């Protein structure tokens, strides 16, 4: 039941702060996708505020998005890697600060860095769960570098995704082939069945012609190797992100768009249900990965006492 599953999540969060980030098969929701796929745009619809689209901007370093749900009025804060706890106050102030963080953490833009940032939002309107945003796979050279920066990103990703209880969340534009998409190849190396891999659809606003519709018919009947199927996230208009109009209104504007056109109605209901459940699906998977992991977590820690003490 609802109350008592909260602090089981808060244990893993306690572990990932206080305990060792290396080795340990820690429960964790991982986001995979390419720089300009809008994997940031999913988490911005998901929470309300997150890193700007701008001129081609995605995260350059692992960004921990902690979402907490409580009744009183919302708040934001980020913990820096230099041991500094920063209060941003209201969640509208979040975009301005995070863009600075990235820019600093990566060495004034260098494109890669494996130093964490840990962001928290507590608000009434967000699902309460923890998603980790790994740097988005760039397809062009970052600044004047002697790199090869996208390769360095892949190397960071493979390390996170290979652990058992890591949930693999893959983000695919609806008119682009899933099978083709680098993120799903990468996750096929750590998951060939499709068991802990989830596929989330983005960009339904560029489907105009029937070539697009034929790709939608194919993911409907699901010939791609996913066993937890697919979810459809509405990726939010240039005005909505710019002005920041509420997630209670956006719940109404997301749900409205899919229901009214019948083809979308069909893709949506086939894939899961008429009322999107992605958060409650992710919460279900998270808590099922946690409560099978308690003997294994107890045992890694106990073991690593004896290895390092010798």
């Amino acid at each position: 039941y609802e109350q008592k599953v909260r602090p089981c999540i808060d244990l893993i969060d306690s572990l990932r702060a206080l305990g060792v980030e290396q080795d340990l098969a820690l429960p964790a929701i991982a986001v995979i996708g390419d720089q300009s796929s809008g994997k940031s745009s999913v988490l911005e619809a998901l929470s309300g505020v997150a890193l700007p689209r701008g001129s081609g901007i995605v995260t350059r370093c692992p960004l921990v998005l902690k979402l907490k749900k409580q009744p009183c009025e919302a708040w934001a804060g980020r913990i820096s890697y230099r041991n500094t706890e920063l209060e941003l106050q209201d969640p509208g102030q979040v975009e301005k600060e995070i863009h600075k963080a990235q820019n600093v953490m990566a060495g004034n833009g260098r494109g890669i860095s494996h130093e964490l940032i840990s962001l928290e939002i507590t608000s009434p309107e967000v699902p309460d769960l923890t998603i980790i945003d790994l740097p988005g796979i760039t397809r062009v050279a970052v600044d004047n570098q002697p790199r090869d920066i996208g390769l360095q990103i892949k190397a960071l990703i493979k390390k996170y995704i290979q652990r058992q209880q890591t949930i693999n969340l893959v983000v695919v534009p609806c008119n682009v082939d899933i099978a083709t998409t680098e993120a799903l190849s990468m996750a096929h190396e750590v998951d060939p069945e499709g068991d802990r891999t989830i596929g989330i659809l983005t960009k339904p606003d560029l489907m105009d012609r029937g070539t697009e519709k034929s790709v939608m018919n194919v993911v409907r009947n699901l010939t791609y190797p996913l066993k937890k199927g697919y979810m459809i996230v509405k990726c939010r208009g240039q005005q909505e992100i710019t002005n920041r109009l509420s997630l209670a209104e956006a719940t109404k504007k997301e749900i409205t768009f899919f229901q009214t056109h019948p083809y979308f109605r069909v893709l949506l209901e086939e894939g899961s249900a008429t009322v999107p459940r992605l958060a409650e699906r992710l919460t279900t998977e998270l808590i099922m990965h946690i409560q099978k992991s308690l003997p294994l977590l107890e045992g890694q820690i106990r073991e690593s006492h004896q290895k390092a003490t010798e």
């Binding site: 493979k158 390390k159 190396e189 750590v190 998951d191």
Partner: protein, 51 residues
Amino acid sequence: LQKAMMQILQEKNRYSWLLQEQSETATKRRILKERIYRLTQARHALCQFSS
């Protein structure tokens, strides 16, 4: 048993999962490559000094 291990080869999607990275031995394989290479071309330069 021998005949049974040839049954494993028949799938062509499992190659990258059957190979799954450790990955700190692999992380070290690049460093060791260098270090022995560097000790070689060190032993070579020195070999030529006394010859």
